[PDB]
Amino acid sequence: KVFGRCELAAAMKRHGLDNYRGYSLGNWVCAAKFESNFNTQATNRNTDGSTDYGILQINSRWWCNDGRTPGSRNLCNIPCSALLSSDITASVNCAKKIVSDGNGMNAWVAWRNRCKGTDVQAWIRGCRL
Numbered sequence: 001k002v003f004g005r006c007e008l009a010a011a012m013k014r015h016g017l018d019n020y021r022g023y024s025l026g027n028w029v030c031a032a033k034f035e036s037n038f039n040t041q042a043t044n045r046n047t048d049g050s051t052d053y054g055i056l057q058i059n060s061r062w063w064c065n066d067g068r069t070p071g072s073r074n075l076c077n078i079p080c081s082a083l084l085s086s087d088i089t090a091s092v093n094c095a096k097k098i099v100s101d102g103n104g105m106n107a108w109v110a111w112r113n114r115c116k117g118t119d120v121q122a123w124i125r126g127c128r129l
């Protein structure tokens, strides 16, 4: 599923992501924009053989199981396929564990390089929330 900007902000907010670990809604929507262009089906193979999945491009090296990332963990206890669902519940739940890991949203390199320190409220501007 490809979410609309306001549609995804509402869904993230309904699943408790708004201000989770102190990160306002616009941070999450910005990160989703750059990671997947709001497409729950997004996948990207990494140099190390791991793969990133879903709206927030969650990586199989630590977070989910795909059966093909040697020596990896599955910290969210989910098959990576769950992160591709139209229903963002698994992506959000897992993102909560990742953002809680110590480096906050810096875990998402694209958030650090494209969202961090920018006017992230623009991502939720005009949305009924």
Ligand SMILES: [Cl-]
Pocket: 005, 033
């Ligand atoms: Cl947009």
Ligand SMILES: [Cl-]
Pocket: 024, 025, 026, 027, 120, 121, 122, 124
């Ligand atoms: Cl915001």
Ligand SMILES: [Cl-]
Pocket: 065, 066, 067, 068, 069, 070, 071, 072
């Ligand atoms: Cl594996």
Ligand SMILES: [Cl-]
Pocket: 073, 074, 075
């Ligand atoms: Cl594990």
Ligand SMILES: [Cl-]
Pocket: 065, 066, 078, 079, 080
């Ligand atoms: Cl699995």
Ligand SMILES: [Cl-]
Pocket: 011, 086, 087, 088, 089
């Ligand atoms: Cl949803």
Ligand SMILES: [Cl-]
Pocket: 021, 022, 103, 104, 105
């Ligand atoms: Cl933090």
Ligand code: NA
Pocket: 049, 050, 051, 060, 066, 068, 069
């Ligand atoms: Na992989």
Ligand code: NA
Pocket: 053, 054, 055, 056, 057, 058, 083, 091
């Ligand atoms: Na994701």
Ligand code: NA
Pocket: 060, 061, 062, 063, 064, 065, 066, 067, 069, 072, 073, 074
């Ligand atoms: Na894994």
